[PDB]
């Protein structure tokens, strides 16, 4: 669907409504400017053909006709300026209003809108959709009107000069319109066809580049490479056919134009010889009507662009038309004055609109008084965060009524209520400004003294003092520059600066140490006496000193009372407390050196295509020189027939040679792009995981490099050799011939050819539009939008949208002025290079009359020099426009050859190394330090050590991100540590073979990822370089207890699975990951988070195959669920990388340490 036309120009004022009307009138005038030139030129050639009478008064008459040409030139100068300037100004101002209103509408949106609509889609639709609207209401509409005016002027001038000859053109004119329409529609950046061809291979590229570590883990690079190559060859085939047909179309356009010349002259000489028309009358009519018919097709991309703009405006306007159910832009709600903390919930049933079939809540009733510290305890899934979100009115409850000190929310203001409730969420985000602004983000008017007070209440002033720019430090994106503890404490301060009336903490001390959490809680109890408070966390240290503790079960608050009340109640909380106690190099031709025959044929055909322009200049001059000589009717009839036949033969040659040049260069270019994509992708795969770490080149840079290199390198190689050759042939022959024929006129015209060529280029660039507008500026503006869509979760709490929209507008204020000036400049350059042609006509034919009068050259020679040098410098402009840039192509080639010759640490195709015939299975790590390359200043390990024997079920337990999967990567050769020693059965991994190690063991990743194929080819990814038997495919499925969910689906072993397994559930993809690794039969096995999303009955059937297969092979399981940790052989707890405790489980349970506190979570 698409908008109306009245609803596209919705943001148009009286000033924008004037610009469009006057630009439309000026475009009509500009349009009619050219057929009048052909009328004057036809009338002028009769002054030169009847000049010599057996030359007096030739220079007077050429003076008058120079005035005519210069008057038309001035008229077109003024009208073309007005046209382009006024349409680009109307579009610019309107697009500005649309950008602002679109973003302002995105801000006033219900929560969860972003979950429904991905935020890369919002951030991309923003820019793409506004550009797609801008294109259609800009100068494309002016060009449309200009071409309709040219059409009508052409046919009126035609029919007025002579109707008999115009009717014949009009009979063959629809074919001309179709030829031109098809040509320009094909021409309007036919690049999306290549994107549509490469879409599927890009899908494979994005799959493999989402799970690079996984594919490297299984070692199956070759399989994914075969897949990419198959997709690639398909796209290559489609491209070859597209080149064939596009070039056939250009060829038939040229054939039709030339055979039209042939017919026009064959019948026009019949009319001239009969005495009815003259030769000027025939030139007038033929050129007027031909130009009108071609101008109708020069306006076909405008209807396309307008349809696309209409389509995109529909989406945007629909986004800005919806009004959510809650919005801080409505002042209807009443603001209270005497603020008193009181919470009343009663019969509160609520469900998430994202998944409304499930009901987490089934009514909660609660009454909380002022200052009453209420804690809520329960497992993750009851919805503590759901209650926190329910509080601030992020949603509305489906049943009941909620109230805060008497009256209900549903009749009072959302903004006022939102500001007085200081809330901290589970995972805070921090804005990438200075920290002073971050803490200022509480409210508007906060001075530095209050800032210091709040930061000293947060006890986060030490790391403020040790780091430079103590109030000027720009924190990185998503709080990466500082640590987690500092970040959470300053987030607490950021909440406190608002001076709230109700405080709501949710997991305020997730990764916090002892003394900082203690001082934080002391400060929290320093500012709780005037404010209501609700705290949600896991640590029971900051819970025992509360007012009232409650307990969630199935969303329902079941237990109520104080501490001793739930002690004597002996419930789940009693169980809890009972258990707790730079350069650029040229090698681009060597890349394409295998396809030499295509280039030989292509350069030959390009030489001919360049020569076709002077040949036409010569034939045209000679036909018009048949009627300036004093010959009989038989001589004129025979010579006219000869030259009309020559027009036809030149048409056929043009058809063949255009087809051939296009086809051979296209085939060579497509072979080059397929080979380049293949080689680059194979090189990417052969890079280890350490190269991919770089945030520049992890996901987007590589896929954009594939889809950019493809086009660019064929651009350089084909453009250079074809355009340089075609234009050398064309202009060189033109200028040499026109020098031997007349050298004075040639020297005069040789000063005007630059402007004619560049005029062609500026016009064609106007036809293609603008690829990029205000790039730097668009970055400056879109950074704000990115950081405002990413931090939406936080910013709806902070209620700082207004203060964010103003930042957006301020960021827009520079590109706006820049764009209006750019329009006023482009209008001038376009109008001047358009009028230059009329002035060139005038100057050349006044000089020509002078020469002819002094008998220094003939008329036919003036006409030949003019046609070869001027009619044939426009062609240089067109050809040079159509060619793709060489600078971007050459830098792209530099990057491609960098990636191609790129040499990684270890070679994947290297079998060299220690290859023992036997192994033992014992591993030993000692004093092993690991620092991430991306984070060289932050150490995650401190020289850990381990000892592993055969069959030893070694468990690893710790906090999140403490070096859990680090030991996994440190075994699987992803990272080699700077210091340490790793003995694998007395064999150091650095001297062994690199594929053998990765071949012997087998693991399950943290998150299961499956490939775009059936489940059969998902499990048969585990064993490669080997013939997989289906009896092991069903065996591994029965063993993993997925055989039931396979044998149930239609096309059981050929059911096509979505990307990452988005079709089936998390438990099944976790099982089929267990079965994917099960077929490996590894002598060393690792498990990371083996029971993340799995049922309780499914864990026993998963582990039962593990327990029976644990024997013989070393086993290492890392999980959070204690069930697999109790039965393990030995357990190793980590703390910031350091091995704290190690030994048998009983020895760890005898001496109570930190592991005892880990066992004390929920048992009893």
């Amino acid at each position: 669907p698409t908008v109306s036309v009245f609803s596209m120009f919705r943001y148009s004022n009286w000033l924008d409504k004037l610009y469009m009307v006057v630009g439309t009138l000026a475009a009509i005038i500009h349009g009619a400017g050219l057929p009048l030139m052909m009328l004057v030129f036809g009338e002028m050639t009769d002054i030169f053909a009847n000049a010599g009478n057996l030359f007096m008064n030739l220079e007077e008459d050429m003076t008058r006709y120079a005035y005519y040409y210069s008057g038309i030139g001035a008229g077109v100068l003024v009208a073309a300026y007005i046209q382009v300037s006024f349409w680009c100004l109307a579009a610019g101002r309107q697009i500005h209003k649309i950008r602002k209103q679109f973003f302002h509408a995105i801000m006033r949106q219900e929560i969860g809108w972003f979950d429904v609509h991905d935020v890369g889609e919002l951030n991309t639709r923003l820019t793409d959709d506004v550009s797609k609207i801008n294109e259609g209401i800009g100068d494309k509409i002016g060009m449309f009107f200009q071409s309709m005016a040219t059409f009508f002027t052409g046919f009126i001038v035609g029919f007025t000069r002579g109707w008999k000859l115009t009717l014949v053109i009009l009979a063959i004119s629809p074919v001309l319109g179709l030829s031109a329409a098809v040509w320009a529609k094909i021409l309007s950046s036919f690049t999306d066809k290549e994107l549509l061809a490469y879409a599927k291979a890009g899908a494979v590229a994005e799959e493999v580049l989402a799970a690079i570590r996984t594919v490297i883990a299984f070692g199956g690079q070759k399989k994914e490479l075969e897949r990419y190559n198959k997709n690639l060859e398909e796209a290559k085939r489609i491209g070859i056919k597209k080149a064939i047909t596009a070039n056939i179309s250009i060829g038939a356009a040229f054939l039709l134009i030339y055979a039209s010349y042939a017919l026009a002259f064959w019948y026009g000489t019949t009319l001239v010889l009969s005495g009815e028309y003259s030769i000027g009358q025939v030139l007038t009519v033929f050129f007027s009507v031909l130009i009108g018919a071609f101008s109708v097709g020069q306006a076909s991309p405008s209807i396309e662009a307008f349809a696309n703009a209409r389509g995109a405006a529909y989406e945007i306007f629909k986004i800005i038309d919806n009004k959510p159910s809650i919005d801080s832009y409505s002042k209807s709600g009443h603001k209270p004055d005497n603020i008193k903390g009181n919470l009343e919930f009663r019969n509160v049933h609520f469900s998430y609109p994202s998944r409304k079939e499930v009901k987490i809540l089934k009514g909660l009733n609660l009454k909380v008084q002022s200052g009453q510290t209420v804690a809520l305890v329960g497992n993750s899934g009851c919805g503590k965060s759901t209650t926190v979100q329910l509080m601030q009115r992020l949603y509305d409850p489906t049943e009941g009524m909620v109230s805060v000190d008497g009256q209900d929310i549903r009749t009072i203001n959302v903004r006022f209520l939102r500001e007085i409730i200081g809330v901290v969420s589970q995972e805070p985000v921090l804005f990438a400004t200075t920290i002073a602004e971050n803490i200022r983000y509480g409210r508007e008017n906060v001075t530095m003294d209050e800032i210091e007070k709040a930061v000293k209440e947060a006890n986060a002033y030490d790391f403020i003092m040790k780091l430079p720019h103590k109030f000027d430090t720009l924190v990185g994106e998503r709080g990466a520059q500082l640590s987690g503890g500092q970040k959470q404490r300053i987030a607490i301060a950021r909440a406190l600066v608002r001076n709230p009336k109700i405080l709501l903490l949710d997991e305020a001390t997730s990764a916090l140490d002892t003394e900082s959490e203690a001082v934080v809680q002391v400060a929290l109890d320093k500012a709780r006496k005037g404010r209501t408070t609700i705290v949600i966390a896991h640590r029971l240290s900051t819970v025992r000193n509360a007012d009232v503790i409650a307990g969630f079960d199935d969303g329902v608050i079941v237990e109520k009372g104080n501490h001793d009340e739930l002690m004597k109640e002996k419930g789940i909380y009693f169980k809890l407390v009972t258990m707790q106690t730079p350069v650029s190099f040229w090698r681009i031709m060597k890349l394409n050196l295998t396809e030499w025959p295509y280039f030989v044929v292509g350069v030959f055909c390009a030489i001919i295509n360049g020569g076709l322009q002077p040949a036409f200049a010569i034939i045209f001059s000679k036909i018009i020189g048949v009627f300036t000589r004093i010959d009989d009717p038989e001589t004129k009839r025979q010579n006219s027939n000869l030259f009309s036949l020559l027009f036809l033969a030149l048409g056929i040659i043009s058809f063949i040679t255009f087809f051939l040049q296009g086809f051979t260069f296209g085939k060579a270019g497509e072979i080059l792009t397929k080979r380049l994509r293949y080689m680059v992708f194979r090189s990417m795969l052969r890079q280890d995981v350490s190269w991919f770490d770089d945030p520049k080149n992890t996901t987007g840079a590589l896929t954009t490099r594939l889809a950019n290199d493809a086009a660019q390198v064929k651009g350089a190689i084909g453009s250079r050799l074809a355009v340089i050759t075609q234009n050398i042939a064309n202009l060189g022959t033109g200028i040499i011939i026109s020098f031997i024929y007349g050298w004075q006129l040639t020297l005069l015209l040789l000063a005007i050819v630059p402007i004619i060529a560049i005029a062609g280029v500026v016009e064609m660039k106007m036809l293609s539009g603008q690829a990029l507008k205000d790039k730097k500026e668009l970055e400056g503006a879109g950074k704000i939008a990115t950081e405002a869509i990413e931090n939406f979760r936080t910013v709806v709490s902070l209620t700082q949208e207004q203060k964010f929209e103003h930042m957006y507008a301020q960021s827009l204020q520079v590109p706006y002025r820049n764009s209006l000036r750019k329009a006023h400049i482009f209008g001038i350059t376009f109008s001047f290079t358009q009028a230059m042609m009329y002035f060139s006509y005038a100057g050349c034919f006044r000089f020509g009359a002078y020469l002819v009068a002094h008998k220094l050259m003939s008329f036919e020679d003036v006409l030949l020099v003019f046609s070869a040098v001027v009619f044939g410098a426009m062609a240089v402009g067109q050809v040079s426009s159509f060619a793709p840039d060489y600078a971007k192509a050459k830098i792209s080639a530099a990057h491609i050859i960098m990636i191609i010759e790129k040499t990684p640490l270890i070679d994947s195709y290297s079998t060299e190394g220690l290859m023992p015939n036997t192994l033992e299975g014992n591993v030993t790590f000692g004093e092993v330090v690991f620092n991430y390359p991306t984070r060289p200043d932050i150490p995650v390990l401190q020289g850990l050590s381990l000892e592993v024997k055969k069959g030893q079920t070694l468990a690893l337990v710790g906090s999140s991100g403490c070096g859990k999967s680090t030991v996994v990567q440190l075994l699987e050769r992803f990272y080699d540590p700077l210091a340490g020693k790793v003995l694998l059965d007395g064999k150091e991994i650095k001297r062994l073979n690199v594929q053998w190690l990765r071949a012997h063991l087998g693991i399950v990743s943290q998150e299961p990822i499956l490939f775009d194929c059936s489940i059969a080819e998902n499990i048969a990814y585990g064993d490669n370089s080997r013939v997989v038997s289906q009896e092991e495919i069903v065996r591994a499925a029965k063993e993993a207890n997925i055989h039931a969910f396979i044998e149930s689906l239609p096309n059981k072993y050929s059911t096509k699975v979505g990307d990452k397994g988005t079709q089936l559930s998390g438990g099944q993809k976790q099982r089929i990951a267990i079965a994917r690794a099960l077929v490996r039969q590894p002598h060393i096995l690792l498990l990371d988070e083996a029971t993340s999303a799995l049922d309780t009955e499914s864990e026993k059937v998963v582990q039962e195959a593990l327990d029976k297969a644990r024997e013989g092979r070393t086993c290492i399981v890392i999980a959070h669920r204690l069930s697999t940790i109790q039965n393990a052989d030995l357990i190793v707890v980590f703390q910031n990388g350091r091995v704290k405790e190690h030994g048998t489980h009983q020895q760890l349970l005898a001496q109570k340490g930190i592991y005892f506190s880990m066992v004390s979570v929920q048992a009893g």
């Epitope: 010599g52 057996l54 009969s274 005495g275 000589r629 004093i630 010959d631 009989d632």
Partner: antibody, heavy 119, light 113 residues
Framework: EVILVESGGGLVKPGGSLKLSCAAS????????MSWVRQTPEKRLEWVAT????????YYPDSVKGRFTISRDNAKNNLYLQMSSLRSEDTALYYC????????????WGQGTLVTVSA | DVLMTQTPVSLSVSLGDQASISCRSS???????????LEWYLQKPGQSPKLLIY???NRFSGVPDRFSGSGSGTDFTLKISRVEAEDLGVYYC?????????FGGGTKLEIKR
């Protein structure tokens, strides 16, 4: 005014080869069709040959084609007629004549040149 | 071939009378362009022929208005009014409409005295 003069006509034995030249001044020779016309001793005019303005097209009557051959030299402004396999009936007075716009065939005649073919 | 035949072979005209010659063709000359080309030439004793009307009823630059031509189809004629002694010679009728160009025989004009 237009001045065409002719030269080269003399007595020739039958079967011989002669060559006539006609020099043209006062107009742009390289723009005009030019013809040779012939007047017999009974005083009956007969067209002989025609050549166009570039030198491309030439037209002869059946009687005389094959034996006669017309050419023009645009640089010296000259018109030539080469004659071979002469006959007694080709004895006559030869005129060069210049073509006229508005389509009249012989606007400006030259003076004669007399050619006799006898023993 | 198309052959022109002129009706009077000799014509005697008193000084001041009117003289009418006619040149009936044989194939009804008309070109493919719809123009019919039929010119009259006058040879005065001792000079080269001179143009006189370059088609049916036109007049060459310099030719008095006494000479007039008129003709249609396949019959054409020339009439002179108020002959003088200066106008005294042989009148030929050339036709260049068909592929061999042919002159007529001629009509000697003789003024009485």
């Amino acid at each position: 005014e237009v001045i065409l003069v002719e030269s080269g006509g003399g007595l020739v034995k039958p079967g011989g080869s002669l060559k006539l030249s006609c020099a043209a001044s006062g107009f742009t020779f390289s723009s005009y069709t030019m013809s040779w016309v012939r007047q017999t001793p009974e005083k009956r005019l007969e067209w002989v040959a025609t050549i166009s303005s570039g030198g491309g097209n030439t037209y002869y009557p059946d009687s005389v084609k094959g034996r006669f051959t017309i050419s023009r030299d645009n640089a010296k402004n000259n018109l030539y007629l080469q004659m071979s396999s002469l006959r007694s009936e080709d004895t006559a007075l030869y005129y060069c004549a210049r073509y006229y716009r508005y389509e009249a065939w012989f606007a400006s005649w030259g003076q004669g040149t007399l050619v006799t073919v006898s023993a | 071939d198309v052959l022109m035949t002129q009706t009077p072979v000799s014509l005697s005209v008193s000084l001041g009378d009117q003289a009418s010659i006619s040149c009936r063709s044989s194939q009804s000359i008309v070109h493919s362009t719809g123009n019919t080309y039929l010119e009259w030439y006058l040879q005065k004793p001792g000079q080269s022929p001179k143009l006189l009307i370059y088609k049916i009823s036109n007049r060459f630059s310099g030719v008095p208005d006494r000479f007039s031509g008129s003709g249609s189809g396949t019959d054409f004629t020339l009439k002179i009014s108020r002959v003088e002694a200066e106008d005294l010679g042989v009148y030929y009728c050339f036709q260049a409409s068909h592929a061999p160009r042919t002159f007529g025989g001629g009509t000697k004009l003789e003024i009485k005295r």
